């Protein structure tokens, strides 16, 4: 009943002592399944270790069950045959990292796929290293600005943390990632090393044409200085989609060990869980719940808890993880959304009735929360977003009473009106991230309540005209806001004056 007990290796064992295949560095391929070889030999291989197949392929080896090495094939299983010769490489699989990976779409073993030349990497980091502990890291001390006003006001991100974008399929959720990338152009144009940034978009099991659309959007927004795009599409193999987030996270770990800041966007991390379930169930590892095996939480935690700000001794480098989860019709109670919501330090939740109700971007909150999302803000946005969050918290209770709000009292009517103006301030066009200074100005206008008399369909037109007016005329005021970091009574008085005058001359 044994797996290695077949008459081929038994016959070559008892017809005469071989000592010829060496059984330790090499190994002959036994039963090759749909994507998993169970090779015989490799007595000196270690666990999770990348071997190569004589076709010219690679493949990483797990389960070792006392006579057999469970090597999962890094490619198509058409050209691996029974009896082929495997060879050890000698090391757990590495990822070529460096500052030469930037602006070039690569593939999860660290090899170039866009065909515009090879990667000029100088050092290879071992993938799947342990996360840094308690003392080497510190908390979120820098504000990570998405550019989305709803996110940067209500649920801001911190340079130093992990923030799980969660929603149904085609409910924003990658547009927020592309806005998070394109927002960092203005911080990567100039000075301040502790502001400049490196985005890493790890696409796991997407279509490959949408990765081409993603990289064309980033190139014509000139988003290829900050960015690396790691891509393991749906045509690629199951273990190469499994190993894609750890590769990009190793690149980001290179960026945060050397002082600099970085973020990573794990697009379709649920598909990484699906690929791991595929390869484990074909390794006949015992399935846990929904056929996901035991160490799936251990997988996503070992992936996601590598993101933290570092103390001033260990550079000042920080990482920001942004995993992405498709839920199936709001089923937040599934296996993978419950696992990653228990892992991650915040969630950005997108319920979709807001999207088709016409408030885009689709961050439909109340379930959405950031567990550190007050200290990860500039004091301008801290003040304005604190008052704005309390106003929306008073608004969202009474909206079912606002569908019949016409025949109620006046205090509600004022509160619900202010909430409607703020909720239509939070909507924003796609692929146009706002800087912190102008969104502080807009949400300031909404909080101080120079909008309560206007029509609802005229709020967004006011928003665009107010952006044009404040960018064109009052450059120095946005300079005050972005250099002081806050409104200190003179920006307050000047904004009183300019918003009263522009409301006097709007129509």
């Amino acid at each position: 009943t044994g797996t290695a007990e077949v008459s081929s290796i038994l016959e070559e064992r008892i017809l005469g002592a071989d000592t010829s295949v060496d059984l330790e560095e090499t190994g002959r391929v036994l039963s090759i399944g749909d994507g998993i070889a169970r090779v015989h030999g490799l007595r000196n291989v270690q666990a999770e270790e990348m071997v190569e197949f004589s076709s010219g392929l690679k493949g990483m080896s797990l389960n070792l069950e006392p006579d057999n090495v469970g090597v999962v094939v890094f490619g198509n299983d058409k050209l691996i045959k029974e009896g082929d010769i495997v060879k050890r490489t000698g090391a757990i699989v590495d990822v070529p990292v460096g500052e030469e990976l930037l602006g070039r779409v690569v593939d999860a073993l660290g090899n170039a796929i866009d065909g515009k030349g090879p990667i000029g990497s100088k050092a290879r980091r071992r993938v799947g290293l342990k996360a840094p502990g308690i003392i080497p890291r510190i908390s979120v001390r820098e504000p990570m600005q998405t550019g989305i006003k709803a996110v940067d006001s209500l649920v801001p991100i911190g340079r130093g943390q992990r923030e799980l974008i969660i929603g149904d399929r085609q409910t924003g959720k990658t547009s927020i990632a592309i806005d998070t990338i394109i927002n960092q152009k203005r911080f990567n144009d100039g000075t301040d090393e502790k502001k400049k940034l490196y985005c890493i978009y790890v696409a796991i099991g997407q279509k490959r044409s949408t990765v081409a659309q993603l990289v064309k959007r980033l190139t014509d927004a000139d988003a290829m200085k900050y960015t690396i795009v790691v891509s393991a599409t749906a045509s690629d193999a199951a273990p190469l989609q499994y190993l894609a987030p750890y590769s990009g996270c190793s690149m980001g770990e290179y960026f945060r060990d050397n002082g600099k800041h970085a973020l990573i966007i794990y697009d379709d991390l649920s598909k990484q869980a699906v690929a791991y379930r595929q390869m484990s169930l074909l390794l006949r590892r015992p399935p846990g719940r929904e056929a996901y095996p035991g160490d799936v939480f251990y997988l996503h935690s070992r992936l996601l808890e590598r993101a933290a700000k570092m103390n001033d001794a260990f550079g000042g480098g920080s990482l920001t993880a942004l995993p992405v989860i498709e839920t199936q019709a709001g089923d937040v109670s599934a296996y993978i959304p419950t696992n990653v919501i228990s892992i991650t330090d915040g969630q950005i939740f997108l319920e979709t009735e807001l999207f088709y109700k016409g408030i885009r971007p689709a961050i439909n909150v109340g379930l959405s929360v950031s567990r550190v999302g007050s200290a990860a803000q500039t004091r301008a946005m801290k003040q304005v977003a604190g008052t704005m969050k309390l106003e929306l918290a008073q608004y969202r209770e009474v909206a079912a009473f606002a569908q019949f709000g016409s025949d109620l009292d006046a205090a509600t009517q004022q509160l619900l009106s202010r909430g409607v103006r703020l909720t239509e301030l939070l909507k924003q066009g796609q692929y146009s991230p706002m800087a912190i200074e102008e969104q502080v100005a807009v949400i300031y206008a909404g909080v101080r309540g120079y909008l309560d008399k206007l029509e609802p369909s005229k709020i967004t037109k006011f928003e665009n005209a107010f952006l044009s007016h404040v960018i064109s005329q009052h450059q120095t005021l946005l300079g005050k806001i972005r250099t002081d970091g806050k409104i200190s009574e003179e920006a307050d008085a000047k904004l009183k004056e300019i918003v009263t005058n522009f409301l006097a001359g709007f129509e």
């Binding site: 038994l10 016959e11 064992r13």
Partner: protein, 188 residues
């Protein structure tokens, strides 16, 4: 792999797998009857109560089992086929399966001789002239260049008799099944 030499009867299971490996090895090195008589001598050895009591019992520390079988091999000077066969059965721990692999490889060699395991039921104690003419017509009946090994069994229940199974081919003139065919004919 190496080209595994095809055995004539595919005996399946674990013991058939060990036996096909041993047959392919002994047919590459062409000492088949030598390995067969040595496995018969081993099967005579491992029915001794001291050796089989030492082997079937656990907590005799498998390394000591391998050492004891290697010393028993080096005492009676086996060929290098069955030496490595007994060592492999000791290393895998399927020394419980060694009389069954001896039976399976004996079956494979008995088909390599060309024997056919003939079964006959006369359903009565038959005489020697009947057996002589039956072996004559059956040896003519089977094939060219093959030798039969026949057995006879009896039971008074099945009336008449003379069922003959030769090489999966089962000719049946038993009076009971004639009454059964007429029974299916009569009920309709």
């Amino acid at each position: 792999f190496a080209k595994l030499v095809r055995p004539p009867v595919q005996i399946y299971g674990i013991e058939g797998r060990y036996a096909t490996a041993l047959y392919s090895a002994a047919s590459k090195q062409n000492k088949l009857e030598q390995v067969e008589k040595e496995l018969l001598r081993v099967g005579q050895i491992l029915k001794e109560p001291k050796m089989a009591a030492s082997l079937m019992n656990p907590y005799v520390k498998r390394s000591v089992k391998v050492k004891s079988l290697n010393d028993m091999t080096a005492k009676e000077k086996f060929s290098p086929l069955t030496s490595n066969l007994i060592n492999l059965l000791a290393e895998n721990g399927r020394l419980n399966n060694t009389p069954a692999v001896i039976s399976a490889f004996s079956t494979m060699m008995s088909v390599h001789r060309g024997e056919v395991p003939c079964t006959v039921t006369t359903a009565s104690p038959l005489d020697e002239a009947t057996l002589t003419e039956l072996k004559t017509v059956l040896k003519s009946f089977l094939s060219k260049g093959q030798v039969l090994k026949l057995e006879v069994k009896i039971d008074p229940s099945i009336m008449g008799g003379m069922i003959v199974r030769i090489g999966e081919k089962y000719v049946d003139m038993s009076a009971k099944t004639k009454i059964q065919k007429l029974s299916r004919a009569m009920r309709e």
